[PDB]
Design an enzyme around this catalytic site. Structure first.
Site, short mmCIF file in Angstrom:
data_model
loop_
_atom_site.label_atom_id
_atom_site.label_comp_id
_atom_site.label_asym_id
_atom_site.label_seq_id
_atom_site.Cartn_x
_atom_site.Cartn_y
_atom_site.Cartn_z
N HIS B 41 -0.70 32.79 -17.70
CA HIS B 41 -0.45 31.38 -17.96
C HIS B 41 0.95 31.12 -18.51
CE1 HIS B 41 -0.80 27.48 -20.12
NE2 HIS B 41 -0.33 28.16 -21.14
N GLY B 143 -0.56 28.08 -29.59
CA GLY B 143 0.36 29.19 -29.77
C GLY B 143 -0.31 30.55 -29.86
N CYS B 145 -2.23 32.06 -27.61
CA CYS B 145 -2.38 32.80 -26.37
C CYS B 145 -1.83 34.21 -26.50
CB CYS B 145 -1.67 32.08 -25.22
SG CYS B 145 -2.36 30.50 -24.68
C1 LIG Z 1 -2.87 31.06 -22.98
O1 LIG Z 1 -2.84 32.17 -22.55
C2 LIG Z 1 -3.51 29.97 -22.14
C3 LIG Z 1 -3.40 28.63 -22.51
C4 LIG Z 1 -3.99 27.64 -21.73
C5 LIG Z 1 -4.72 28.01 -20.57
C6 LIG Z 1 -4.84 29.33 -20.21
C7 LIG Z 1 -5.61 29.37 -19.03
C8 LIG Z 1 -5.94 28.06 -18.71
N1 LIG Z 1 -5.39 27.27 -19.63
S1 LIG Z 1 -5.54 25.58 -19.66
O2 LIG Z 1 -5.55 24.99 -18.31
O3 LIG Z 1 -4.40 24.91 -20.29
C9 LIG Z 1 -7.09 25.25 -20.54
C10 LIG Z 1 -7.11 25.23 -21.93
C11 LIG Z 1 -8.30 24.99 -22.60
C12 LIG Z 1 -9.46 24.78 -21.89
C13 LIG Z 1 -9.44 24.81 -20.50
N2 LIG Z 1 -10.65 24.59 -19.75
O4 LIG Z 1 -10.55 24.39 -18.36
O5 LIG Z 1 -11.69 24.57 -20.29
C14 LIG Z 1 -8.26 25.05 -19.83
C15 LIG Z 1 -4.23 30.33 -21.00
#
Ligand SMILES: *C(=O)c1ccc2c(ccn2S(=O)(=O)c2cccc([N+](=O)[O-])c2)c1
Ligand SMILES: *C(=O)c1ccc2c(ccn2S(=O)(=O)c2cccc([N+](=O)[O-])c2)c1
Lengths: 306, 306
Positions: B41, B143, B145
């Site tokens: 991501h 932050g 991740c």
């Molecule tokens: C960090 O590694 C990271 C941050 C956001 C991410 C992610 C994979 C997908 N996403 S997101 O699309 O921004 C997201 C965030 C919270 C919940 C959901 N969801 O679909 O439930 C998606 C990795």
């Protein structure tokens, strides 16, 4: 989101843990610069534990009676002195892993991380609070003498606790890093017991604010209270009296959530008087009192989930 | 004595945490030998989060598009590849602090330590369980991740978790260190939600054994149960069915306390059916399900307080 009992990362402390041995007694020591700190109980004769005179016990030791092991390396003791209930052992080499550090005497109700250690080898890390009766609710087995409690801020390690003993109720007593016991305890075998404990009111209030920050308000109500009216109820439930200083400490959390401190005090009063009604707060059915206002600001988002 | 939610000492992992930046996205990475692991991501365009094609996003990057910071030193990326939901970044220097390590895929119900990290700087360490619905009840802010979960045995670090996302209920989802998600989640913006969760029966049983080891027996009774009779009650209270494999795992704790597994099952059945009656077990009014039988043997004395 979430709220966990969270310890400080322990690496800077792990690099300071050593093993100290006098004859048949072994425990943990803390190696900072060219000094090793450890409980003076390491010099204690097996079949005398009631009335030890540590001054007379220590005069009979030389520098080479102390074995100090850092990993698989032996450190040479080139000096020793007593400081209250600790020994300071000067050694021939400065710990290359010494962090920026300070010694601090923690106050009742404040929290710190414990690095549980055995034979100089760190085994686990957990968070705990200095109870109003000057004990901690730790988790320790035989061999844990000299395990260290600490807080970290901006790469500086504030050491506040060295572990000594388990009291009859299963809670734990120890010293600051100047060797002064927390509470009225002494390092010998006596009938000493933990005094009556209390619930840390300021911390319960902080934790209710954490619950609101994370999005839960079910326990609020339409009432307010006077400080003294709250303290009458606090007394009856074995809570510490709330002071104006404590109200002032809760200022930033109050501002972030828009809940006046005395309004949260009214919410806590109803919780004490009516119980939980089979509900939880941040996953708990008990009112949690081992998170300080600082801990809440450190861990919780700066933005309330309104 | 005592029983705490205890994490592994985090130093060996702290020495592996770095910062990885692509344009305006920054998160944490794990630096082992000459490889840096991080969530894929990091390469995601701000105003597209619904339908990212990571293969097409990554073909457009060079090695020098990745900024990797280890402390105040920049690491040079000299190669990159995708592995499931992670990126492997080869760098010009081997981490001198690399521990002996392994990658493991943890099973539901097992526990591990989380080193919460921000901008490559470790912030805290806590213990948590992989829930049967493949989420964890963590504590994470924006932050976080790329924060890592792990277990340690005999100086070997078993990495089992890299953090990705927070789901709508406030629980957390992520991958193993091969980049395969735990559970049915995907790394893009969808309506995905945590499935229905269950209580980890084996762990509740282990924790009751821990309570006996530490000296408390108030919840035992004179009854026994069949495995299937227990599972009928477990079903009604949203507990996982108990299996013979799980009974066998509880063998050593059963031997240490002298309480047959099916007798403890009868004790748990009465606790589920009658409630706690305003009593606690190891300080808790809820039945705790995030301690494994291994965790109990690790932390509790080998000698029961009879
Ligand atoms: C960090 O590694 C990271 C941050 C956001 C991410 C992610 C994979 C997908 N996403 S997101 O699309 O921004 C997201 C965030 C919270 C919940 C959901 N969801 O679909 O439930 C998606 C990795
Ligand atoms: C380790 O540093 C250590 C171990 C035992 C100690 C101690 C100071 C005193 N004692 S003790 O006499 O063995 C002891 C142990 C547990 C409880 C009590 N008590 O009097 O309550 C005393 C330091």
């Amino acid at each position: 989101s979430g709220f966990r009992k969270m310890a400080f990362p322990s690496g800077k402390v792990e690099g300071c843990m050593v093993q100290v041995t006098c004859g048949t007694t072994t425990l943990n020591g803390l190696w900072l610069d060219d000094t090793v700190y450890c409980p003076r109980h390491v010099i204690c004769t097996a079949e005398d534990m009631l009335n030890p005179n540590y001054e007379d016990l220590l005069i009979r030791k030389s520098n080479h009676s102390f074995l100090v092991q850092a990993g698989n390396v032996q450190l040479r003791v080139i000096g020793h002195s007593m400081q209250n209930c600790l020994l300071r052992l000067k050694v021939d080499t400065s710990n290359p892993k010494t962090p920026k550090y300070k010694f601090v005497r923690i106050q009742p109700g404040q929290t710190f991380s414990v690095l549980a250690c055995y034979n100089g080898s760190p085994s686990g890390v957990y968070q705990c609070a200095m109870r109003p009766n000057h004990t901690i609710k730790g988790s320790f087995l035989n061999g844990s003498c000299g395990s260290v409690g600490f807080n970290i801020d901006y790469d500086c390690v504030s050491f506040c606790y060295m572990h000594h003993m388990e009291l009859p109720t299963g809670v734990h007593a120890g010293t600051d890093l100047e060797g002064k016991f927390y509470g009225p305890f002494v390092d010998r075998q006596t009938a000493q017991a933990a005094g009556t404990d209390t619930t840390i009111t300021l911390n319960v209030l902080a934790w209710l604010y954490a619950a609101v920050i994370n999005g839960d308000r079910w326990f609020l109500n339409r009432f307010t209270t006077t400080l003294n009216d709250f303290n009458l109820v606090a007394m009856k439930y074995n809570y510490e009296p709330l002071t104006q200083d404590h109200v002032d400490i809760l200022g930033p959390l109050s501002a972030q959530t828009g809940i006046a401190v005395l309004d949260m005090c009214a919410a806590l009063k109803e919780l004490l008087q009516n119980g939980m009604n089979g509900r939880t707060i941040l996953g708990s059915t008990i009112l949690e009192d081992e998170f300080t206002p600082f801990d809440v600001v450190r861990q919780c988002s700066g933005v309330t989930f309104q």
